[PDB]
Amino acid sequence: EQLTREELYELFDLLVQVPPRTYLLNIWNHKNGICRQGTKDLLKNLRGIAPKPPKITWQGCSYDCNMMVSTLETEQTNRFYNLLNKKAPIDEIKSFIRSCIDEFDKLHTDLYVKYEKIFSEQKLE
Amino acid sequence: EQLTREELYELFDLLVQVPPRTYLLNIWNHKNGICRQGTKDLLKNLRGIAPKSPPKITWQGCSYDCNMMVSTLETEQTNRFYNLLNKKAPIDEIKSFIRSCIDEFDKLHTDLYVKYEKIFSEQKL
Numbered sequence: 001e002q003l004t005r006e007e008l009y010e011l012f013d014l015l016v017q018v019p020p021r022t023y024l025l026n027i028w029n030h031k032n033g034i035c036r037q038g039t040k041d042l043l044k045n046l047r048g049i050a051p052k053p054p055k056i057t058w059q060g061c062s063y064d065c066n067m068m069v070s071t072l073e074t075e076q077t078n079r080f081y082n083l084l085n086k087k088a089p090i091d092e093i094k095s096f097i098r099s100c101i102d103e104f105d106k107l108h109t110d111l112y113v114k115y116e117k118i119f120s121e122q123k124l125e
Numbered sequence: 126e127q128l129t130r131e132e133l134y135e136l137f138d139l140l141v142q143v144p145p146r147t148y149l150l151n152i153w154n155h156k157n158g159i160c161r162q163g164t165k166d167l168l169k170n171l172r173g174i175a176p177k178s179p180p181k182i183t184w185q186g187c188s189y190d191c192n193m194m195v196s197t198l199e200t201e202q203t204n205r206f207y208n209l210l211n212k213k214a215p216i217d218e219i220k221s222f223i224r225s226c227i228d229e230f231d232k233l234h235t236d237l238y239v240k241y242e243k244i245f246s247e248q249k250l
């Protein structure tokens with residue numbers, strides 16, 4: 001039952017107090033599902049404009065993108081558990097989760113911009 | 126003074142509660158300055174590749190199109206910003222919005238560059 005981003009942010013107002021940790025972990029799994037669908041969408045969009053100067057291949061783009069997103073996911077999850085363990089207020093936790101999603105959106109933007117330029121230049125000459 | 130992108134992102138993490146309107150307007154003006162420098166950089170780069178049946182695309186046309194696209198996006202984003210202010214959006218939502226507007230401008234700048242790179246390349250034969 002994957003929550004949409006909209007449903008997650010609405011649910012972030014039903015949390016006026018810090019909920020139990022199981023609840024918090026459930027929310028983080030929905031966060032992961034949202035970011036991972038963003039990655040799937042990025043790779044789908046990049047595959048569309050990849051060709052069939054630099055000599056970057058689809059396999060290279062895919063390795064780079066997957067390494068950046070997988071490393072970001074690990075780093076964010078670690079920051080999440082540290083927030084939990086230090087018993088942070090609910091407002092801080094909510095801002096942290098929304099900021100992690102924003103950070104993934106910026107990474108997906110950075111990757112799209114980077115490869116849009118390379119692929120478009122390869123399609124030339 | 127004009128904040129760098131990195132300085133603006135730093136401020137975002139220091140808005141933890143909802144700040145006065147003057148502060149948010151000030152942040153928006155720095156956002157505008159960052160996106161306008163991105164537009165200046167785009168036109169500089171495009172000048173490098175500009176020339177020196179259907180009509181030939183010239184520097185004038187390229188410049189008119191780019192400035193219309195970025196100026197209209199500026200207007201539309203500012204109108205969405207004022208909507209959030211007036212509806213008293215919580216700070217996490219405003220922060221996501223401003224971050225997303227900068228991503229949208231980065232994408233537009235890249236889309237424009239790729240568009241003209243292709244057009245100027247094809248004409249050159």
Ligand SMILES: [Hg+2]
Pocket residue numbers: 117170238
């Ligand atoms: Hg460029």
